């Protein structure tokens, strides 16, 4: 009545149930994970095996799917393991593993392709001749919620400039302290975008109201536009924290086509549900059910990203390996 | 790590 099947609920993995729908609905990443070249991967300690397997039981089962092979491979399998590292740590610790076995092979450049931007930060002295310019990728955006209304809020905060004068006037070195500022400008925004909603702080959870739309335009934040490929991305999916921090209920929100038919993912339970109980209904306030993860797609990128997966997209030898383990535990 | 300290792309270890 969904068409789309749960993950099985197997300890306290908080984000992970919810991470892993996320990622196996970026279309173009799951067919890449599934060209990976496994035959060779030792199944107790490969992710990027584990993560095959997690895909190909997505796709395919009708009932829902259980993990303990995939939180094995990284090793988290002690009771608080998630409670103890964050959703931010997991994402890197499943994109590096999938993208260092793509090297070599047909999708080598699949995970910076869909997930890595270029910022430029700089210090620029008010009063002598002096800059630094700084250059680096990033991977996610993580956004300053508390006291920010809503999300344009928060990337204006991330850009802010910053005044380095009085006691913490920058030492220009050569030229001794100086005042100056220090600001940042994106180069580029990735195809996907990772936001990371800065409730969880410390130990506490920020509840307040944060407003984030269904479409969001970032041309205003990068150093310089183009036309005819604006920076206008499109919400696909709201990972959600129910609690005060302590423990908590995850679930994530997704309209996994980028057509705004929205589903709810609930470990087992994947139901249907009002475009308004995944966005407004997650924006909190003073309720404590919001989103601390959003995933945006670039509108330009949109059908590219969610490029239609069939069977024939998955390998023969990993259907044949993924059957053949099914076989010997029955 | 970034900048603003925030960690950046790929797997970086403890600050």
Redesign the interface.
Known sequence: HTGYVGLKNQGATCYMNSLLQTLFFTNQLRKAVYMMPTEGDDSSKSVPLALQRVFYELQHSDKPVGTKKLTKSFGWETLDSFMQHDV?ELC??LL?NVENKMKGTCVEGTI?KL??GK?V?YIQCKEVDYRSD?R?????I?LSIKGKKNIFESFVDYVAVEQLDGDNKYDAGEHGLQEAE?G?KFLTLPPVLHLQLMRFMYNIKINDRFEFPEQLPLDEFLQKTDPKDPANYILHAVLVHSGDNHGGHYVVYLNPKGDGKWCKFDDDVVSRCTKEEAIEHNYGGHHCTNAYMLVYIRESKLSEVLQAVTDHDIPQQLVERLQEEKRIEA | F?X?XX?????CGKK
């Not at chain 1, 680096?136 to 996610?140: I, R, T, V």
């Open positions: 931010q890197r610790v590096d910076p997930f890595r910022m930060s700084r680096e990728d990033y991977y996610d993580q220090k940042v | 970034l603003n960690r950046g792309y790929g797997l």
